[PDB]
């Protein structure tokens, strides 16, 4: 009478719609690892997000700049939303954008550096109504929400460095349900994402994450 | 601009100069801050929870 689970990346779907699930279960731990997972993944997950952004000519973000629709403070709205995918060993890197489009620009405008990667091609970072040459530098590293109340402001060296935050967390939404099969139980997990993380391996570090935790409980001791 | 005293005003007899300083700060809803509805149901933010 021995039951070990399995992961399987089975019925993807949407832009980026997941539902890993496990065949087998102990016929009745299957909620609790459910429950656990939701709860992980949400809090646990950390994501690379932009923290500072400096444009070439502005002394504050309630700036305008000359030819351009969108505000500084736009500007710095639409970077927010952009989503970078990074390397595990590069914790923190620097990107520079310079563009002398009269178009619109955009998030793929970034230079393609190695190691950065951006899903956002699509999200466009500011209209330019004439032409005009426009260049600023984003700094990018590793980080996870730890709440509002307990966030460093972040330092600021150059006159014209603006401080920006950044949603680390990439899972959007989290969904778990639970099937008998007899004597057995199959659990069916759905996962969103912005895309940067695959689903099955965010699942795997979920699950690491919370048997560190339980991992000091069959010890009973304080190391 | 020059169809000024010079000052860009009377000044005050007796006001050697003035200065005018603008700062413009951001703020996010934080507890104890006031919600109010349309309908007239009003309620002020206790406590901030976590998405789970």
């Not at chain 1, 700036?63 to 736009?74: A, C, G, I, N």
């Not at chain 1, 955009?106 to 970072?125: L, R, W, Y």
């Amino acid at each position: 009478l021995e039951f070990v689970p399995n992961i399987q990346l089975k019925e993807d779907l949407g832009a980026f719609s997941y539902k890993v699930q496990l065949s087998p279960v102990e016929k009745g731990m299957a909620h609790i690892l459910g429950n656990s997972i939701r709860r992980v993944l949400l809090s646990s997950l950390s994501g690379a997000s932009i923290i500072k952004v400096n444009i070439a000519n502005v002394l504050h973000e309630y700036s305008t700049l000359e030819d351009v629709k969108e505000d500084v403070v736009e500007i710095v709205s639409n970077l927010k939303k952009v989503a970078i995918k990074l390397d595990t060993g590069i914790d923190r890197l620097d990107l520079e954008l310079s563009v002398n489009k009269s178009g619109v620009v955009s998030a793929g405008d970034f230079k393609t550096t190695q190691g950065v990667e951006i899903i956002n091609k699509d999200q466009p970072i500011a209209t330019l109504t004439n032409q005009r040459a426009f260049s600023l530098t984003a700094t990018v590293s590793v980080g996870r929400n730890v709440g509002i109340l307990s966030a460093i402001p972040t330092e600021l060296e150059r006159v014209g460095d603006i401080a920006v935050d950044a949603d680390f967390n990439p899972i959007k939404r989290v969904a778990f349900e639970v099937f008998d099969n007899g004597d057995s139980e199959t659990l069916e997990v759905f996962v969103k994402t912005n895309g940067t993380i695959e689903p099955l391996a965010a699942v795997t570090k979920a699950l690491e994450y919370f048997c560190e935790q339980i991992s000091v409980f069959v010890s009973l001791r304080v190391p | 601009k020059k169809k000024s005293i010079t000052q860009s005003n009377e000044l005050s007899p007796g006001v050697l100069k003035t200065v005018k300083v603008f700062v413009a700060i951001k703020k996010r809803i934080q507890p104890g801050d006031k919600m109010a509805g349309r309908h007239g149901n009003k309620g002020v933010v206790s406590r901030v929870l976590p998405v789970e």
